[PDB]
Symmetry: D3
Subunit: 294 residues, 6 copies
């Protein structure tokens, strides 16, 4: 083989027909953006994450694991959703259709954004297959705005509870450091207390909030402090280090995580690919916690 | 005066109530953006142009003129349109209302984008006051797409002729170097021939196409080659130098230019403010050709 | 209102005649620079802070407060000092005159630099109205050089104690990580110990040093580690995180802070506006600790 | 189709098994680098060109052509050579093997570098299928060093004539502006005269030097002036504009060009993707001159 | 003196003939690079460190020391190794020869890379003069690859123990956060535990592993998290802060450190010189711990 | 020689005691800056030019010359003036003293700025040795301000004629594109006409203005368009290409040029070292036109 099908995330094989493949996990890129009050995310966050992820591919057993995820899980990259270039409605319809087809086939999904709005169609499809979920949500923002429209940025986790896709009472939002509503049922572990508490202390509280519910894990890269993730459309100071974030993600290993995504990487604002690298490393860690179960 | 009202473009006085002022020309910022197939323009193009324009303010008589524009014209900066943060429809309604109020009062407008879509509401208001206009359009793109919707990026100069706002047969598009429709009535002076012909030759042809019609002058900064204007959402190689562009704009002096704008400056892609500087210099040149008449 | 007077810091109203206004607090920009042994700060630090501060304006009650500062305090932005473009003497004379006029009128000041030298004229005016003050000083540098001239960079807090403007014995310098003089009366809480101690421990010591004296709060952004504040003229490694800095500023709430500034933001060295964002967030936090008293 | 095989250059279909496909032209990426006396090219030049090429894909008939290349030519992207990460010998052996297999199958090649050294293995394979070729070589450097080793950077066009792969007497080197050997048989059209002469004049001379020989076209992006192509390992001032370069490439339409490449794009030194964009546009123009024959 | 010999690191005197000088310590630059699977380091890491080090030179007694290193140690900068531009073998032969000549003369060495491969020739020369050493190694990578060739990147600390240059059983690797071999005798203090433990706790363990052996101290700047050191060829998230790193280096004061280096600064990926600044500050701290003994 | 005295511009030997050396030409760096109305130049322009100049050193006979300058001229680099870090008066006194000592010894000078103000002390020393000179001045600015003080930026060529150092009537200013005084005796060849006329036409006019007077050649890099020289404190659009500038400098070969400098390179605003590279190439061309006479 002089040229090869090893062109996707972590040099994994591409499969443009994933639904009836032998894959366990399928990576989908959704380079969807919408006009915001601040900067736009752009159309290259899936591409920047894939490109920088070659920094991680040489490790046979990614630190600190004692196995190779690739020998426990069959992971393929199906490329990008064609309708990510449509408006919020068109993108949502096609993404939910893509997701339902994969979940019905027994595949699970790691998806890369794109604006955080991509998580709402994913949650609609996941709720159909797995039932109402607990949300584990890393972000500087709660995204529970209740006064905007159905397709507005920052409203996904008002709509999701209203549609019964997630149980807010068993959901946790980690790293929040912008105005939020204390009485909507979500448990907000704000960045101030998360930076001051030990990882094990936070993880113990997350496990007790989530319980045994199926979990959708959604990681907005702007959860990280802008020193570690300058490449994002809506930065907020006082965030998490990449050390603390990856340790928190590893601590989620014993949860029943049924799907996950990483969103808001904005390459136009990245500095020496550090934001894309943090996103790729967190995404690989999400695959490792799944493979640790097998 | 220890602090002062000299905070706008070229340190000109700000006036947030311009409609009944003594101004001859009013500068308006429209930091409007929409989701595109490529990069987003962002919300700081008016701000970047204003900021860098201090490089030009120290010249009493801006080169190469033998007068000071500020002693012939009363120019104020009214800030930014509040609805530039709305969708294409909301922005258009408010911008056209703003423009009609200024033109009805006898003011004329230099406006800064923002996406090129801002020119369509401006043309609607200008046609009401001045009648059907000839368009002088600098761009790498013709923006005459006829198969998208009424608020889509790149459709403004299909809609404008259809609404009778401009006469395409007396309009000229300069710097085009992307696919265009040869039979829609616009005269396309593509960048290949514009770079090969003398300025006077091009200007003579523009004057004969435009004739004596009132002219709306719209300058997309991506008319300049990306070496001179890297800060734009839709770059295309093989463009104009800033030398040739400013010489072409100066050659328009004898036309009856009733309004003008400069659009598509994307500061997130700018390099050492050169794109914003070129936009500010072209905008100042547009004021000079007006003041040269007085 | 199609265009509006909401063009300043945090989109607050501009008022170019603040002295007899209804404002409680007035923001002044001083884009003053001087030749240094290292990099120059430039003339856009006030502008970069204002521009990025729109990221904070959408929060009605800025996290983590349970009120809106804008509903307790009348804050206006008076623009920039005209003489910030003069030499150190000319700038100082005009800034002190500006400040005395505001303080005599019962206004208080949040000022943005510009070089740290701007704090000396501010302290001269503040001492006249409030009496000798305790200085709370965040910096990597003590700025107590005693062998340079009266207008040299880095000498302000040798001159201030000599002129009786501050009491060094009740002043504290936080984040210092460059050579300093242990016996000049200032209490130096160096970055090594500040990074190792709890916030509450540091705050308790600051309160006991300062006591009940009126406090001038001056924040050099290079107090933050260059990972969080690369945009500064004189970076030093081993600094504070933005998390720790904002927590320290919040802990100053119960002090009698009569005036404050944020200096040394150098946009030419900024990376994705993170330094300007940290400066804008710290400045907003200073307004919140004032509004928390009302 | 919710996800698709449209992930390569210009969103063309990927085919990891191109040798027995229906393709007419096959794109291969060779992200090969070697230690140099100056900067290294890196491993992302194929990826940066592919990514930015989406700016060109929306044009059905790319300006200024009156047809769609994609409706005359079947072009696929086979990804990257696996051995581009080996040393100069390992890469050369695998690339020549890849190329021979494609040419023997009747495919033709557009290849992207990577260091310019990639052209030597390509020429070895092309000479086998097409016979000794005339080289049309755009570069600031002649790459005819005769005193280094067989795998050294900058020696390819000493070795190629010695191995009988090209006829130097019918080869032309365009844009040269570094020390060269006047008596080695190549015709050097240096950047000084190329910038001063008309395109048609240069093209007429190229046609007479090349005659009817089969042509290998190799474009080092550092032929362009660093204002247009800052993203390259070995910049030299006084180069070609992208306007002149694309016009020169279009003028080669009537030559018998049997293979072509674009090399030396160094994304770590690129500014707002302008170098990658120029490389992608030149590469698309090379496909258009081929499709213009059909 | 109108011009002066104060052109090297920290403005120290240059001496191009250091071997028979009065120097105690000699700084050597080795701008050596080799083709890697990731980015290349480049040829300006010695130059970038020297340039930014002027930020530290103004401190007479560098914080937090109570003496001036320059009054206890005679330090000169001998410039760069001429053969750093050769291949791994040529560079190694000349560097080891340079080092042996200095050590035989009673000088000690602070060296700047360049790729980490430069440490292997340095260790060969140091073992000859000081005997088998304990290695104190800061890195995200263990560089103990045992399946590559003798001159490959990342193999130095497989070869060194095999040649008896270091005792792996008394060596410690700090900050590791990539796949490593647990049973090769090195003690790996990975970044996860180093970030969670106190500095004194880590230092106590290092002292007990190293004992009284002579120590070679080698600092790969990619030990720091990419937020603090973006300018490096092989970044890995979850690293050390510059605060923790400098505190760890200061804690090594009581060890018998016979030579030291700082490697992998890649200026092409640096952001506002922060990586070069951290490297220069760590290097100055290494000189201070030596001067603290005198 | 394992390390070497080849650390200066073009890897030429450093000589910190140049006055009694065997040098014909001596390079001096003057990293002098002063507070301006725009950006500051900084303190690294000499260093950035030296660093990038290694791109030119490998050419034995620099293109397009048929000799090696280094075999006709003995050129050394004496480093930087120690007082460049003082104020305009202190710097001027020391620079003029440095220059007088070199010129009295029969050396000639190529100097690198630093602010353009450095040329005034150089002209004072040159007039003493060579007599009143003709100035050949490349710039976007005339620097003839007559209403500022004796040490202000932009006043040098008001003061120089007043002190009889240059004859304005035989001096020419090339590339001017900012407000200038038409009646002060200088001949202004503005960038508009210089870009439109042939090089030979401009050179013929320069030769006739200058005649046989001794010439001081001073090149402000902001003569180049900001696309080619973004790294400068005072950019102005519509400038010269680097092709045209180097051709103009080569055409000055037959003039009696007694000294020369290159100023205003501001590395903080440079993009991929292109401005420093253009400055280094122009400086090398100035040495070649001198060596062409021998
Ligand atoms: N939350 C954000 N990401 N941006 C600000 C928009 C305001 C929330 N409706
Ligand atoms: N024309 C542009 N600016 N972008 C590409 C969109 C395609 C035109 N409808
Ligand atoms: N302290 C600084 N900000 N810079 C260094 C100048 C030396 C103190 N006189
Ligand atoms: N030619 C280059 N690309 N670099 C300089 C190396 C010297 C030629 N042997
Ligand atoms: N370890 C590195 N620095 N890079 C990856 C190469 C793989 C180790 N042989
Ligand atoms: N000319 C400049 N370089 N800057 C503007 C200052 C105004 C001239 N006195
Ligand atoms: Mn979010
Ligand atoms: Mn968010
Ligand atoms: Mn347009
Ligand atoms: Mn356009
Ligand atoms: Mn300070
Ligand atoms: Mn400071
Ligand atoms: Mn080449
Ligand atoms: Mn080349
Ligand atoms: Mn840049
Ligand atoms: Mn290493
Ligand atoms: Mn490493
Ligand atoms: Mn950057
Ligand atoms: Mn000048
Ligand atoms: Mn100038």
């Amino acid at each position: 083989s002089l040229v090869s099908n090893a062109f996707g995330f972590l040099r994994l094989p591409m499969n443009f027909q994933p639904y009836d493949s032998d894959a366990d996990w399928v990576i989908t890129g959704v380079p969807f953006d919408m006009a915001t009050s601040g900067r736009a995310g752009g159309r290259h966050g899936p591409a920047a994450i894939r490109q920088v992820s070659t920094n991680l591919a040489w490790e046979h057993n990614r630190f600190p694991w004692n196995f190779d995820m690739r020998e426990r899980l069959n992971v393929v990259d199906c490329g990008d959703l064609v309708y990510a270039f449509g408006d919020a409605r068109e993108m949502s319809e096609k993404l939910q259709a893509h997701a339902e087809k994969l979940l019905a086939a027994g595949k699970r999904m790691l998806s890369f954004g794109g604006d955080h709005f991509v998580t709402l169609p994913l949650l609609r499809a996941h709720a159909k297959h797995f039932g109402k979920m607990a949300l584990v949500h890393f972000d500087a923002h709660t995204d529970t705005y209740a006064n905007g429209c159905e397709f507005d940025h920052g409203t996904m986790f008002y709509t999701a509870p209203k549609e019964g896709l997630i149980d807010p009472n068993h959901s946790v939002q980690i790293g929040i450091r912008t105005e939020f509503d204390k009485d909507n049922g979500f448990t907000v572990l704000d960045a101030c207390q998360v930076n001051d508490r030990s990882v094990d202390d936070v993880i113990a509280q997350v496990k007790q909030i989530v319980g045994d519910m199926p979990v959708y894990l959604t990681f907005d890269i702007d959860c990280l402090d802008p020193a570690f993730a300058p490449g994002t459309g809506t930065p907020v100071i006082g965030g998490l280090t990449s050390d603390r974030a990856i340790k928190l993600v590893r601590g989620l290993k014993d949860l029943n995580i049924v799907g996950m995504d990483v969103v808001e990487v904005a390459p136009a604002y990245d500095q020496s690919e550090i934001t894309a690298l943090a996103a790729a490393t967190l995404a690989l860690e999400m695959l490792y916690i799944q493979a640790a179960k097998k």
